Design a protein around this ligand. Structure first.
Ligand SMILES: O=c1[nH]nc(OC[C@@H]2CCNC2)c2ccc(F)cc12
Length: 351
């Protein structure tokens, strides 16, 4: 092939995000049976149907036994095959079981997107597949220069917002990319001047990123159980890098993660301390803020292209009986996000 003139970091990013074997590995991690439900047989309607059954299982547990539950739990396993051999699979009988399976289905949706991009499309040997795959993202990806002002600000954000309670690892920024999802800026226009626009973190596993860059960050579908998400079906962000970085699900086999920085249009925040499984905001509110016990020092907010960057070190928020150790931000309309940066991170696991 012609060999590809994309910068080396952008090429390594494309290789990571389209890696078929990482997809399979993520699926086997969820205890999916690849013999019965392989990567290519995965589809939107089957995932949607699984989401619905999980909503039924949600319904049964809300209103209380292990007898009428058994049936609903088995029906989940009928739609998404799990690898339990000659089995009896574990009973899905509580809220933890529902959260956990709904998070799996979120990820399968993005893996299906990634694989459909690979299998749709044309085959041409004289093109570098790195170039072919890049183009399917419909995203401009540029390397940010290590000495720029924006680089300095990003690395400070990363440097100051690592929580003491997440000290089992630390992070080094390997590559910073500036990203522009096609049409996203246009989508964001109504919100672009809104008050309380903040640059915030979103971590996800690497096998979601092809999906995220082609479709943007998305809200879970109507079929998904709203109870499987602490603040219901929105798009979730943190102001502490380590809280988002935990969602990369890195470890000691797969050490590199990917994390986003988006401009999020929060406007009037609906401030909450505990789980609230809403599907719409109170009139007048534009976001939810889950109130952390600790917050980036508000005095240290700095500005980057007109957006607040809450990069102060963590201090007491003053909030008392909250479920959350750190802040969480949730929007409920996809147009309130404009993705700005993508970081490739190395996790140094101290344990
Ligand atoms: O960076 C983040 N990535 N993903 C998060 O959540 C993914 C699942 C959907 C919301 N609950 C779990 C998530 C939830 C809270 C938060 F502050 C950050 C993040």
């Amino acid at each position: 092939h012609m060999k590809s003139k994309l910068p080396k970091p952008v090429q390594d990013l494309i290789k990571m995000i389209f890696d078929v074997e990482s997809m399979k590995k993520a699926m086997v991690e969820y205890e999916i049976d690849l013999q019965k439900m392989p990567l290519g047989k995965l589809s939107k309607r089957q995932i949607q149907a699984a989401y619905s059954i999980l909503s039924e299982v949600q319904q049964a547990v809300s209103q209380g036994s292990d007898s009428q539950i058994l049936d609903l739990s088995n029906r989940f396993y009928t739609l998404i095959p799990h690898d339990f051999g000659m089995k009896k699979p574990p009973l899905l009988n509580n809220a933890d079981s529902v959260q956990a399976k709904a998070e799996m289905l979120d990820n399968l949706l993005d893996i299906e997107v990634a694989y459909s991009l690979l299998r749709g499309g044309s085959d041409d040997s004289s093109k570098d597949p790195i170039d072919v795959n890049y183009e399917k993202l419909k995203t401009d990806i540029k390397v940010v220069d290590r000495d720029s002002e924006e680089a300095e600000i990003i690395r400070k954000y990363v440097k100051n917002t690592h929580a003491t309670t997440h000290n089992a690892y630390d992070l080094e920024v390997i590559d910073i990319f500036k990203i522009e999802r096609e049409g996203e800026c246009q989508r964001y226009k109504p919100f672009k001047q809104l008050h309380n626009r903040r640059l915030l973190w979103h971590g996800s596993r690497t096998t979601n990123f092809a999906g995220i860059l082609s479709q943007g960050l998305r809200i879970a579908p109507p079929e998904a159980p709203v109870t499987g998400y602490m603040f219901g079906k929105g798009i979730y962000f943190a102001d502490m890098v380590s809280k988002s970085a935990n969602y990369c699900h890195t470890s000691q086999g797969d050490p590199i993660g990917l994390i986003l920085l988006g401009e999020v249009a929060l406007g009037n925040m609906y401030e909450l301390k505990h789980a609230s499984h809403i599907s719409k905001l109170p009139k007048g509110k534009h976001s939810v803020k889950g109130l952390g016990k600790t917050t980036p020092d508000p005095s240290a907010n700095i500005s980057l292209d007109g957006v607040d960057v809450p990069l102060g070190t963590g201090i007491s928020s003053g909030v008392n009986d909250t479920s959350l150790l750190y802040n969480e931000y949730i929007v409920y309309d996809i147009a309130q996000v404009n993705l700005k940066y993508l970081l490739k991170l190395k996790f140094n696991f101290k344990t």
